[PDB]
């Protein structure tokens, strides 16, 4: 966080409203450019996400990358997403990192696989759903209960209340329904259990 986003004006771990994204366009675009220039940043994100509670402290970088991706998909005029490979892979890898750190439920964490078969506004709405879930729950270490049997912190989304993406999976299921001619075989990744 210090190397990528040093100002840390929004250092609080919980996620703010999506209307705040336009207030910090410069900082989030700087974070996105830093990510684009250095592919090693994603690797360190995954290394941090290996420890469950550590990815909560990356919530600023996660929100900045999510906002940059959301803005690019807002500005993406292409009928598909294959014309922007870096942004598509950044969204996929950001979703993978967040789900790996157990900041997202598995039902809402399998969403990055269907990113490549979607037009920019579907993946934009999906990343907005990710932002909304991380607003409702928030990447906070206190939600992680240290399981002494194995020695690893465990994020129990069932105990959080609506942690399986109650209203957040509605957008994903609507996207699946709209593009059912291409997303039919991927319906097994977004089931409730």
């Amino acid at each position: 966080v210090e190397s990528v986003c040093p100002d840390a004006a929004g250092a609080e771990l919980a996620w703010p409203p999506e209307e705040h994204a336009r207030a910090t366009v410069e900082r989030d675009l700087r974070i996105g450019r830093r990510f684009r220039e250095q592919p090693l940043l994603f690797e360190l994100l995954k290394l941090v996400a290996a420890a469950p509670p550590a990815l909560c402290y990356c919530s600023v970088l996660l929100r900045g990358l999510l906002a940059a991706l959301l803005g690019h998909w807002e500005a993406s005029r292409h009928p598909d997403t294959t014309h922007s490979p870096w942004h598509l892979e950044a969204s996929c890898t950001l979703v993978a990192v967040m789900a790996e750190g157990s900041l997202l439920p598995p039902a809402l964490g399998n969403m990055h696989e269907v990113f490549s078969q979607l037009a920019p506004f579907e993946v934009r709405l999906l990343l907005l759903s990710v932002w909304g879930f991380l607003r409702e729950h928030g990447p906070l270490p206190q939600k992680f209960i240290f399981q002494s049997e194995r020695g690893r912190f465990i994020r129990d989304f069932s105990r959080e209340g609506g942690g399986e993406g109650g209203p957040h999976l509605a957008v994903l299921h609507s996207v699946l329904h709209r593009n059912i001619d291409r997303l039919g075989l991927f319906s097994g990744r977004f089931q409730a259990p």
Partner: peptide, 10 residues
């Protein structure tokens, strides 16, 4: 009613 749930560009 089925098509109403389909996302659309704003």
């Amino acid at each position: 009613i089925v098509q109403s749930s389909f996302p659309v560009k704003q």
